[model samples]
Target: RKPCKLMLQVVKILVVTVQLILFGLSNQLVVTFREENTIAFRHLFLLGYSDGSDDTFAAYTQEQLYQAIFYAVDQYLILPEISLGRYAYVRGGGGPWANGSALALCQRYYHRGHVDPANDTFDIDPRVVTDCIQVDPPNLTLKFHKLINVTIHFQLKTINLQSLINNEIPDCYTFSILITFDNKAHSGRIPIRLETKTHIQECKHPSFRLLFDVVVILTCSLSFLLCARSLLRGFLLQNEFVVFFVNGWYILLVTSDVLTISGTVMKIGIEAKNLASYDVCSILLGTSTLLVWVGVIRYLTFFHKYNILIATLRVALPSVMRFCCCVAVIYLGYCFCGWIVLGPYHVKFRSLSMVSECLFSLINGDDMFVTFAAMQAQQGHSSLVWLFSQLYLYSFISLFIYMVLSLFIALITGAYDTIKHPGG
Candidate 1:
């Protein structure tokens, strides 16, 4: 039965995959993003019916496709009519005619309020491809085909649209697509329009910021590695519990180092592709930053003035950890209660994770009365709702904040005093 269930799940996943692929491929324009600086476009030009059998299709050979693409590019006027191949760069200069090159026109259109780019649309004029279209005879009889639409799809890397548009010099590239009809020479065109809301939320300059991140990560990684090695060596030789305390700090540093290193690597990769690092790298950076502070505090343990503080923690931390564990258990129970009972009315408690985070905010001495008022208003201030809210806050504070936390403080205080005077 277990195997059957597993097989069913696998079959369901495969079905979903196939459905997704079919849906994705049906679109005329396929845009794929690779890192930042690179993008690929696969344009599907739906051929029109020419009063022929279904078996008879309209398509173009490779040479015809190239000619069609070059003609379109020349008509599009977004770039120069140099050649129809991969990897084309836009120039800011002018061409032989009074009209500027494709780069200048694109820059003027996207940045400035130039209406010409918007007004101009692409179309395949048979006359445009007269020279490029290679045929055996000058007037070889061939069926004339017209291009209806040409969809442009490119999944560009995440970057702010405002900045890209507003900057004096915008950085971008374009790809040329070739189309043919029934293995015959045909030309087509479509207007290129920038109609997307996608953008990167966080943008940073790569040069200095990247170097600073690398330096920080390297320092933390080396420090953590050395500190952990020293702690392990001391623990093996001395067999002291103090080694474990130091090692705990080292473990945090090690975790921080790993996060920082991973973030740096990912950031480098993302930026190299001219893409945004996004929230993932930001989170890792924040975590590493906090761990660095913890390391600084741990470093103070080596000083004579802080030795007593460290010693007090060494003795009292066990009790503190147990009390915290108990508090967490009670908090989790409250989280579930809120999630199941109050979630229907209050959006804050809609999920267990939400409930848990709200409870943690309460522990940090956030105004629980505001929460009560909000909940009461939502529940029409019913007696049961009011009662439950009061009980929850009272139970939470009285047990965890007042009793458990007070006990922990007392333990730390007593230990500190004992270490201050061993004879006493």
Candidate 2:
């Protein structure tokens, strides 16, 4: 009876060893991209029974699969390039797997990874690994280029997926690709940065620019002649009904045309040769446009009924001038203080010009607290950064939005009241 019992124990031990071998054999891992010729090598792995057995091999659950893919991506640093027309080629699986579970991973990696396979991973390989997949030479065409902006178009022909199993729909898979570039140019003395949007808004050739200038000049000349004719007719008829220029409307029109013509000439003749010429041309053109608008308003004053609006405007103009004078002092004072306090660290307050721009932007109620938060994040909450940021923001709101704006409204209301009661 003892010999039979020992033999039975030996047989059970043999059975257990055979089971262990089978389990190891069933668990196998194969790593490959969805498609072989894809520009992007997405993080993809297949783990299952080598012989497609259902009982011995446990299929990877959704959580397990996600963890596995992330591990592979982080370890191998396999990524796709979109700017160079690279995308993932998924195969064996129908598409990317989808889940509602929100799992947090490494902050840097988590931001790059998204829900869909086709989404961008905003990641770049560190060039540590070898024998990895690469993108083919990009076939790109230059679309447009300006001083610091450029646009290009390219095609992505090799990004797709094919199932490995014949006549069987595979499981879902995820794919992602991304491309990034340094802002500085890599080559050429006159290197322009590339942008998604078109940079050249108008034709750059001298002939085109000159043609535009000629057309504008001729139109302005014709309009001036019509105004002169109208002036002569109004003088002969003594028509009080006609829209007449009581103040310096004629002078404004003449100045507007002169500036516009000079700006056009400078822009066409010399702006390309010198940066200063371009700047001067832009200012002259802008001022001419403003003067033209003023001339139009003054010409409308010829109608006796419309004179009330002009009268009201005259009444409010001095009050606005005074308000502007007060605001200018406040604006300059804050600009100087901001330059001293936050200038060392913050880019927005680095220079007097930058400070002025930031304060002006605050008038529109844009990103006030965001700037404050950024300062506080860089410097401690108790630091001078927070104090100055808070002071500047509140002062800007109080002076620009609360005080100056309210005063302007009051001025307009007073102007209307004076118009209603001429003596009062």
Candidate 3:
């Protein structure tokens, strides 16, 4: 080291020491990351009967239990700063944002059927209101609901549990409703009134088995059409039939998956758009379609140079399957652990219902201040949950666009191959 430079360094250290004695290290090391620098917190208190046992927990009256659950999760109504505090941001008296939770109160029902949100003088969706409970007290509406479940995504832009715990900021917590279209459901078809009561009256409905079967059938049918096209391409157009077949079916399968996720299958079943026989036949065709799809993905992945993409697909596809299997196993394992813990009391499908309820509880009493607080808190502090949630969303949206675009690209290339480069 140069002697002069060494002397200057020592002098600087001495200056720092003097400053520390007077001011301490209060602002010396400024935090660089916004997440680290800004932290917010929210608190929720749940009121319940003295009995704390899980069994006893369930015994609480539905209204009481629901209220407690709502309060506990209500803390999550804040918005994260990163998402620009859009959509799910809370508003009104309780939180920072002006809008309330997506969860609306149940609407009232009439003899022939239910009300429509569109028809409501207040312009509320009868469907959403009938299922979701409102966030704020002033907006509360009490209506009787039949033995029906209305599931929605809660459509939370972000759910960062770790940050909420660490920073005490409960922003960026939103949920989506998982609603299925039911003729019986008198929901979001009408305008909303903050003062009106809503209801989802009880009535006999079709079984979920019937519901799922219909979806499976539609998915299979579309799959078959694609498969048939592929087969024709393979036999008649011999040259690059393999590419055409794989690409066609891959797009088909992806579309089917999206439909399944979106509950299109159930939608069809409810609408009675197509017969079960045709749907079954379509599904029957999909077995071959799947084989073709795997082949296509393998082929593209085989040629693609991006190792990360390949690795991601390989790991992710299997990982998702394995994860589903593992969830099943966990249920099975609970059989031995205890009935209360994981028996009929712990049915696998019910998880969806519970998750939906949890999300509903998060924003039942929301306001603009709470929403802003949630946003600032979450955006202020960076955590793994926030980071991963952001990544997952971006990845899903990006991939959806990429896949859609890729299909068109493949279609164009395939067309050119058919015309320009006949089998030689």
Candidate 4:
């Protein structure tokens, strides 16, 4: 039964894999993040910073901040045709406009003014939100949503949105324009940024999503219950706190199960038009999936042939850390030297972090010719640092590529040999 239980876990792994794929397919969180329109949506706003004739909002008062925000919103809401291409929004496509106004396709829009981005309501007070410029204070949920200066959210086909994308409309796309005010530059001047997006929350297959949710709920509940019962029995049997510490994997499994359940519940029950619960759910689901897959390594030990790699990694970590302690000091020495001496001349050696990365890349035999050529190219002809850089690069690459890496590999191989051939 012990062996049988371990075998059953392989089945559990299979089940979990399918469940994760189905969940991933149904959820649009990752899809929306990587969507091409999302990129264009972001780039469209970047124009406000780069191409706008006015300088960035700086050191403005609270009233000025809102005024500046309103200016940007007004500029954004004014259709390109009317404003002679000064500013724009992601508007177009044939659909129900906000009200019964015989506006052009590009000028028409519907709005979601809900405090919760998850709430999907297109109710437009046309008297107020008659035009995009007028559609602010209503969407500004003062009581909720951090209530930025204003929020303008609407849906349109990808093709319908002008200048952003020209391809056929994808099945889903939405946009939200919200004000971002922060003093990240340390100059006491807050930059006015109008953020944007192409958010999608609609489940692709809702009916099956429901079925998957039920399966997840049941399985996840059983997992937590089993872990709970096992932990109680273990504590009662041992009468020691050590019992709690030893049940770490049970804790991991139980925690993952709880997260899985919570994420699924959010995915089904509460939808985020913005990346609210979906964002939370993504991490919840992702971490649980990661945990479960990592736990698969625990079951891999059931097959002796599959245990060697894991055993080698475990045995090697201690020695590797000690060896790396010395190696890192030596590496840091080169990093600092390269950063200080050659940093001004060499693009690769620009920052201390860049110096380390460049050195690490050199160790992997990456860009050897280009790194050398770049150093040669960056410096004036026959410069003092150029000669120094040649030696510095040469020695570091020689030492790390030959001496350091050989020992690094030997250490792991030794561990591998030791674990695989226990008699030796």
What's each prediction's clash count?
10, 10, 81, 0
TM-score between candidate 3 and the true structure: 0.20
- What lDDT would candidate 2 get against the real structure? 0.41
The residue-level lDDT of candidate 3 at 247 comes to 45
User: For model 3, where is the 10-residue window of minimal lDDT?
Assistant: 191-200
RMSD of 3: 26.7
Off by over 4 Å in 3: 1-66, 69-103, 107-155, 159-174, 177-286, 289-424
Model 4 ranges with Cα > 4 A deviation: 1-17, 26-34, 39-174, 177-195, 198-206, 231-291, 297-314, 379-382, 416-421
Would you list the rank order by lDDT, best first? 4, 1, 2, 3
1-424 in candidate 3: lDDT tens per residue?
Answer: 2223223222322222233222223223222112222221101111232323322333224454245434433423432332333333333221223355443333333323353447663422333333444454212423333323222122333333343454434334333332221224333222111111111122222156445445444544444454455556555766566557224333443443433333334335433543454345344334433433444445546456643333333323334476556645643443333332222222321454543332232334342234333432444234664554334323323442455455444544543554344332
Candidate 4 per-residue C-alpha lDDT over 14-50 given as tens digits, one digit per residue, 9 for 90 to 100: 3654665666674554454445545544455444444
Top lDDT model: 4
Model 4 clash pairs? Answer: none
Clashing pairs in 1: 36-273, 37-273, 58-182, 59-182, 59-183, 78-102, 122-189, 123-189, 124-187, 124-188
Global lDDT of model 4 = 0.52
- Per residue, candidate 1 scores C-alpha lDDT tens digits across 275-370 of 245245545655654554555455534464656555545655666688678767877887777775654466666677778767765766564666
> What are the runs in model 1 whose C-alpha is more than 4 Å off?
1-169, 173-244, 248-253, 267-288, 297-302, 381-401, 410-424
Please report, in order, the local distance difference test score of every candidate based on alpha carbons: 0.43, 0.41, 0.35, 0.52
Task: Report the C-alpha displacement of residue 378, candidate 2, in angstroms.
Answer: 4.9
Cα-based RMSD of candidate 1: 21.0
TM-score of each: 0.43, 0.41, 0.20, 0.55
